Design a protein around this ligand. Structure first.
Ligand code: HEM
Length: 152
């Protein structure tokens, strides 16, 4: 389900993300590398990376484009944490190209964990961060299964 956050929880989310916000491309490159290294089955999902050793593709503009675009979305969700409909819209618009793509909830959840582990959050910030991410994944999965118009 979608469960709204308090203004304190909204604030904890912004604070949690702030080191990443100030280094979005850098952090994105590292997390995306770490995700494809830990969960290598996912690399084939990207036609542009398919068939290359990960270490050969990690320094390409294209790899960094892919990693950066993920982080831009989360940046925009964090910016919209206080606006349910605007947070939902960010997700709705990015969900479209993932629809009917053969990516499991497991592969998405695996990326979520790599992001989490990278942030080294204390439990107060982690709790607020997980409320936001639970909302993100609720919206995202509803949209993947053709129930996106509900958030309009
Ligand atoms: C859950 C966090 C994610 C976010 C915020 C995100 C975001 C985006 C964005 C903004 C785009 C660009 C427009 C588009 O083509 O959709 C995109 C495309 C794409 N997404 Fe993701 N995505 C996520 C997860 C994933 C995962 C885990 C996979 C694969 C195991 C994946 C596979 C793809 C592929 C294959 C494309 C097109 C690739 C290209 O040729 O450049 N996405 N995504």
């Amino acid at each position: 389900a979608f469960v709204g956050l308090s203004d304190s929880e909204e604030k904890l989310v912004r604070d949690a993300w702030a080191p990443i916000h100030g280094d979005l491309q850098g952090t994105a490159n590292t997390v995306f590398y770490n995700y494809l290294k830990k969960y290598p089955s996912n690399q084939d999902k990207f036609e542009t990376l398919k068939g290359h050793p990960l270490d050969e593709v990690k320094d390409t503009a294209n790899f960094k484009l892919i990693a950066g675009r993920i982080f831009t979305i989360f940046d925009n969700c964090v910016k919209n944490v206080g606006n349910d409909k605007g947070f939902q819209k960010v997700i709705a618009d990015m969900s479209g190209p993932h629809v009917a793509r053969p990516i499991t909830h497991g592969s998405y959840n695996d990326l979520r964990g790599v992001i989490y582990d990278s942030m080294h959050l204390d439990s107060t910030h982690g709790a607020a961060w997980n409320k936001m991410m639970d909302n993100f994944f609720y919206v995202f999965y509803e949209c993947l299964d053709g129930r996106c118009s509900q958030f309009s």
